[PDB]
Amino acid sequence: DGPTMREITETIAEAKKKVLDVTKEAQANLLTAKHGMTLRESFEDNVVRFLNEARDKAGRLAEVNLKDLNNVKQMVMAGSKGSFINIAQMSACVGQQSVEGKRIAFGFVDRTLPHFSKDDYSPESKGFVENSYLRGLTPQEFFFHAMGGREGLIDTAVKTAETGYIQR
Amino acid sequence: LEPGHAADQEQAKLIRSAIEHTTLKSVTIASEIYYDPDPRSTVIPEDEEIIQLHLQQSPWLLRLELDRAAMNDKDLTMGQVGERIKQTFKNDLFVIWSEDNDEKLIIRCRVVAEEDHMLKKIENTMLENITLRGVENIERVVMMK
Amino acid sequence: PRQLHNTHWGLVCPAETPEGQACGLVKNLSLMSCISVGTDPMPIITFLSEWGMEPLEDYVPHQSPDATRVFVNGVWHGVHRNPARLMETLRTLRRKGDINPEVSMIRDIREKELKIFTDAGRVYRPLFIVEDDESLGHKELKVRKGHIAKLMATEYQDEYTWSSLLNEGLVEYIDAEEEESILIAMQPEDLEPDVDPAKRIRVSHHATTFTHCEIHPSMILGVAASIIPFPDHNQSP
Amino acid sequence: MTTFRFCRDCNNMLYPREDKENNRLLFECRTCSYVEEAGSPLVYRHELITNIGETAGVVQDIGSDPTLPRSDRECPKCHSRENVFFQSQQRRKDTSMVLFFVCLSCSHIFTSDQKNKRTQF
Amino acid sequence: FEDESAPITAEDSWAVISAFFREKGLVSQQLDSFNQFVDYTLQDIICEDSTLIEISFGKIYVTKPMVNESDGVTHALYPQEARLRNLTYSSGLFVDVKKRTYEKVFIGRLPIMLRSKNCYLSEATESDLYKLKECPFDMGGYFIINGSEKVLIAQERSAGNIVQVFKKAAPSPISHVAEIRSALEKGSRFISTLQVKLYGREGSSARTIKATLPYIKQDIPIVIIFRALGIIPDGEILEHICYDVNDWQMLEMLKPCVEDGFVIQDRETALDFIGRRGTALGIKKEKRIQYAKDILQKEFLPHITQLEGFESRKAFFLGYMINRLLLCALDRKDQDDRDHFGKKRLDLAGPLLAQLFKTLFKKLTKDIFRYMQRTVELAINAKTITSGLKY
């Protein structure tokens, strides 16, 4: 729905504002870590919770709004295929990408790609994909989602190989 | 935690700080060696007060400056720190230090003939191989409810 | 070595890699990447010292501490005290062909280093150049419509060429190491200063310093992934 | 805060020596017989929590570096609003996320650090 | 009339990309590299070891493509017939040889890349490609060897001539190392690794720095290497390393190094220290000193210079590397990212075939000094090159 989309986009707008304050806050040195956890690790932990919790609300939004005749929903309700995350990523928002448990890292110096300026910790800059698949990804998000993906394809071959030897 | 006191957030901190391994290193802002030859007064304006408290000794002086936050974030006294240092070194090193109210935390040590090597190794022993509180091997400890 | 590196943006495809053992070690060049063939450095070396580079044998750091170290294929040849002058000239020269286009030149401003590489095997890609000014207000792409028409006249006659575009300083090739010192716009419209609810969200130009712009973002893909329709609407695996 | 001294004759390094009798600090050379009296009594410092290097990179041309973000903060000295800014350039796990700003008219450096113990940088 | 100065828009990109592909096509990486091999690298492989102990090779010409026949003999070869006949779309190579006293000419077959400047197809029109039975959409960039189409796959490696620093994990007695793989465009492709190592982990006692030079069987204290190069006083040695007199932290880290080199106070001694670590007992001093010099002049940072006056240049560069190692040990700079693709190089046809035809022209040039070390008094094996290529 149009109305559901506007709610999803506001849901997302509010998480990015949460992030912006927790930013400004660490930037003025007012944030505390707590106990053996570095400042930057506390920062990250928080921004990722915000951004996940956004994904999820945005996804609950979409699920709700779909009708019983919605055939995606009919498959999910029957149990025959698909789950919430799939509704969510298709229709509301795909979300934070990650490589080794963390946001996309600064592989150029102090930046994730040359289209960004240095020292940028914002959602966009480190891998939040705000768009759903229906809407499509931008180029930057597209590349970070492929970073992520790639890590599953490798992880998957290593699992398969590791598991097979254990099994024997 | 022990059956009574297992919903004391404060008795859990205590238990955290009796177990979490703590070295001088983790509380110490900077160490310095000064040539301060006369062990009854001092080239250091600030420790006039600390010396001023004393009802053999090296002219080379090692002097550490400790962090108030970290010292209380691990429920540490100067007294305990000094006591720790001392029974590590014993008669082989002479140590005095700033009392608790004192505003800055200072430890100042001297030996008891070539005498600055000993000091920079001695300093390394300080900073790494002196267990202040806690148990070996245990690096962080976290509360969770 | 298996993982998709940020630095492979625009040079190797982020999608095409085999499954299994070769995953991530076999790659495919992006549609527009190229690889240097190598080019001899001696006229650049000569040029530098015509332009003030001071030789290592004279260098006394305690007496010129602000100095920029100048390296060519990995050799520290000396030190220069206005690397901004030197750098504006070097690039002008590569934008006109007097330095070969596939030479890479990086100044690192805060590291006080200027590194140049004329060796084979470096992979690169082309970008539009963005220059203040104009006269007309903002930063703008150096190519403009009149260039495009010359191009399309040429296509239709089947003489202004890709090389004409290099020669006139409109386009320039950049490698991964030089990529670190620029700022690129994703679409030409990020240079000019009520949306469609069904469009995707784009996060605007908070940027007045672009030096370059992509030609087109779909050129990060290689051959195979350039045949998928709508890849941007698909889960990446 | 050590400053480091060299022999006037050899340019080799000087080492400390106590003048046992008059209770004073000398630096001697191990290569000549040169000696000189000490400037301070501090012969060694070890910073465990250091700030040396937060500001590395600040250079006459910092403002021509297109990669640096810019802001409209005003500075304490010139009251100008042309800055570039960056995080701490120490490369620690245990760094704050504070910003350092560089005024592009008067070259003054300042921070967004609201617990600033720093004078210098 | 539309303004010629107007700004472009997104659609207008395709015009620019069309233009790139009309010029470059899709496999220019292949072609550009073979073209440069044929046109420049070939001839440069002949002008390295041109001379022997006399006889010295000059120019090369490259035939168009051709075959040694079964009977009725030597013939222009198009790529359709090589495919079909299990042929090898090859051209031959002719050098310009000289005898001179002190006490044309075929040398081979070069497999030639399709659509290179040398292959027939690169000039051909669309009609010409249909007469020759070659699809006008084929794009080139591979070889036909024994009738099979063969492509060489780009090989990714690190670049050489780059300093890289690394931490080393936990049980190691060194904590960081800085490493370069020194190399040559002119010379050979001979690959010395200098490593610069910082001994002792974070707060060990005297952390020291030592370098590993080639043939020298002990790590050498960096100050001794500075002395063998001519930079004697602690003060000059420290100023090639720490280019900032108020960095008291860097300097305090270079004190143990000053202590570790204190015994060696002049160049001769320094060389000797080195030279003995390279020579057996028995070797006389002057010979030891000279061993050391030759190591340093030839096998230490040879990307810099391998010739005689060039010691300040190496000194500085060793300095720089120790600066890099320290800036990392002092936690100012992160350890180098071994995956940054800009520090990689991908090796294509030309380079791959020069690794080979160097190696082989160096065998062929060794069989020439054996028509000649056993000549008690135009007699060359062509094939060794031909078939090493093809093989």
Ligand SMILES: [Zn+2]
């Ligand atoms: Zn002296």
Ligand SMILES: [Zn+2]
């Ligand atoms: Zn100002």
